[PDB]
Every structure is written in C-alpha cells, then in structure tokens.
C-alpha cells in the first residue's frame, strides 16, 4: 500500500489549486511528510510532471535553520549570543538582511530570518565542515525515493568555494535541491537530529535514520523556529490556531526547468508542528505569483496553514492551546 493519506491528499490539492489561481502563478507543489518516519502522507503538484522530486531550487530562507543547527550543535555559540548583524562585504559582493537590525541573538537570527546572521554563523566554520553538513541533510544526493526524474540538486565542491559562496549558501543560494530533498533535511529537526529515508510505500519495518546533529540540538532549534511563525517573525503567516509551529518561508529561486535553464522567483514555505513533538512535516512551493501579493509569506503561508491544521485535524492530534 502506499503512505499516502487521501484525506490529506486531497486538503493539499485543494488550497494548492486555490492558491495558484487566485495569485496566478505558474505551478506550485504541496509536500507532507511524516516527521517521524520519513512517509510521504501527501505530494501534489499542478498539472505536468512531479516538480517535487524533479525540479531542484536554490531554497532561500528555508535553508537557514541548518546552519543555526550546525552552529549550536558544535557548541561554539548559544541561542543567547549577539552578532553585529550590519550589512557587510565579501571583496565586492554584499551580504544585506531585508529589514535592518545592528545586533541580533542568535534567536532574532531566526526569528527575523537574518542573512548576515546566518552568514556570520557559517563563517565559524570551514568550507569543509559546512559541505560535510550539507551533503549530511541530503543536499546533492540521491534519496532513492522510488520516483523516476529524481534530482540529486547541487552542492559545488568546497574545494572551489568562494568565501561569498559559502555565506550565499548559508541562506539558501548557490546551492540547489528539491522540495522533497528539503522536506527530507527536516526530518533531522523533527526526528531528533537523525535525517530520514522518505518513501512513498506503507513502511512495515522501522526505518533507520542517519545521525545529523544531537537531540538536544534538533529541539532547540525547534524552539527556537517558533519564534518564525509569532508576533514579530517573518512567518506569522503560517501560524495555526491551537499550535505551536516551527517554520521558516522566503524567496526561493529556481534556476532550471524540466531540460531546460530558467529563472524564477519561487514563493516557498516549510514547517511542522507540534513544535515540540512535531507529526508532520509541510512544504509549499508557489512559482512565479503575479497576482495579489509577491511576498513569500503571504503566497504560500495560507497554504501552508490550511494544509498542517488540516492535517493535524486529520491525524486525530489535539490542539496544544485554546483557539483565537
């Protein structure tokens, strides 16, 4: 049998299909996974090809969270400690945030979605240690998933790296994945540090996860990721009544299309909830909104809200606060 719940199938088509017509995009794809065993419980694109497992992006703001998880799992910084967060240069290139803040924690880094923060954080470390951790979640390998069109995305060798590369990847540019492949880097947030096989078959046996980063790590960062979807984050958007949720949106790019090259702006949200003890795993993507907003969060965000308490609502699970 397969993991797919058609309950939840069908919620995703539907707020997928609304969405893209009412911003008039070009495509977009709903991801559900479990968070607990790497299951795909839903997996919508609109009409074509499965742009989920086929079509890599450069993830944009999604992304950060694994570098706040790198940095707290090494121990060298803690969620309490300040950046200067000022725009900066890399020889000509800038790093800048989209709104301006001179210091932040490493909470705010989160919480604000900072560029400079999270390039700040990745510049603790080698270009060695962070290719190593990307191509830990997954990024440029094959997750085997079963689907034909697989893409493995790109991570460059860090023996090439430039120093402006290896910041730009920190928040999510210069390197590529799938919207799966980032659902699937999730898992080591929702499944205590220990990255997930996905598969779209009824698992019968337990499977084995890949250890990422500690446990106490994975937990803080969810707690920390709250902050994303509450009063002052970037992604309050994506709040669901009666939860706590962890996540992240921004502008993702998209640089290739099927065979061919491309170049799009790609809404882009990706959460879980419970926060403490996540069930599933959302992720939106929305290509080239023209309509009603070009905001990330307001594109994809709707969506995402509809599908997680849909799926919540479906899963049996109860709220974990009283209802606004």
């Known amino acids: 049998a397969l993991s797919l719940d058609q309950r939840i199938q069908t919620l995703a088509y539907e707020e997928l299909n609304k969405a893209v017509e009412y911003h008039q995009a070009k495509a977009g794809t709903v991801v559900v996974l479990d968070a607990r065993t790497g299951e795909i419980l839903a997996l919508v694109?609109?009409?074509?090809?499965?742009?989920?497992?086929?079509?890599?992006?450069?993830?944009?703001?999604?992304?950060?969270?694994?570098?706040?998880?790198?940095?707290?799992?090494?121990?060298?910084?803690?969620?309490?400690?300040?950046?200067?967060?000022?725009?900066?240069?890399?020889?000509?290139?800038?790093?800048?945030?989209?709104?301006?803040?001179?210091?932040?924690?490493?909470?705010?880094?989160?919480?604000?979605?900072?560029?400079?923060?999270?390039?700040?954080?990745?510049?603790?470390?080698?270009?060695?240690e962070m290719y190593d951790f990307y191509h830990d979640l997954g990024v440029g390998v094959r997750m085997h998933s079963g689907f034909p069109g697989e893409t493995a995305g790109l991570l460059r060798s860090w023996r090439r790296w430039q120093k402006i590369e290896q910041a730009t990847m920190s928040f999510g540019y210069g390197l590529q994945l799938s919207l799966l492949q980032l659902a699937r880097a999730y898992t080591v947030l929702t499944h205590d540090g220990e990255l997930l096989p996905v598969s779209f078959e009824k698992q019968a046996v337990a499977p084995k996860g890949k250890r990422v980063i500690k446990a106490s790590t994975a937990k803080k960062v969810r707690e920390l990721m709250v902050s994303v979807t509450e009063a002052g984050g970037t992604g309050?958007?994506?709040?669901?009544?009666?939860?706590?949720?962890?996540?992240?949106?921004?502008?993702?790019?998209?640089?290739?299309?099927?065979?061919?090259?491309?170049?799009?702006?790609?809404?882009?949200?990706?959460?879980?909830?419970?926060?403490?003890?996540?069930?599933?795993?959302?992720?939106?993507?929305?290509?080239?909104?023209?309509?009603?907003?070009?905001?990330?969060?307001?594109?994809?965000?709707?969506?995402?809200?509809?599908?997680?308490?849909?799926?919540?609502?479906?899963?049996?699970?109860?709220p974990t606060k009283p209802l606004t």
């Open 45 to 128: 694109n609109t009409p074509g090809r499965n742009r989920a497992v086929t079509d890599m992006i450069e993830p944009g703001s999604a992304m950060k969270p694994f570098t706040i998880a790198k940095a707290l799992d090494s121990g060298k910084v803690d969620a309490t400690d300040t950046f200067n967060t000022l725009p900066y240069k890399i020889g000509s290139a800038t790093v800048q945030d989209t709104h301006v803040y001179p210091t932040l924690d490493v909470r705010g880094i989160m919480q604000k979605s900072s560029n400079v923060g999270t390039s700040k954080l990745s510049a603790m470390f080698t270009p060695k």
């Open 236 to 318: 309050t958007a994506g709040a669901v009544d009666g939860f706590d949720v962890g996540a992240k949106t921004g502008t993702a790019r998209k640089l290739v299309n099927g065979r061919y090259v491309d170049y799009k702006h790609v809404a882009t949200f990706i959460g879980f909830a419970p926060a403490k003890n996540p069930r599933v795993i959302v992720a939106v993507t929305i290509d080239e909104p023209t309509a009603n907003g070009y905001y990330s969060g307001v594109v994809t965000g709707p969506v995402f809200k509809q599908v997680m308490g849909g799926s919540l609502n479906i899963l049996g699970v109860s």
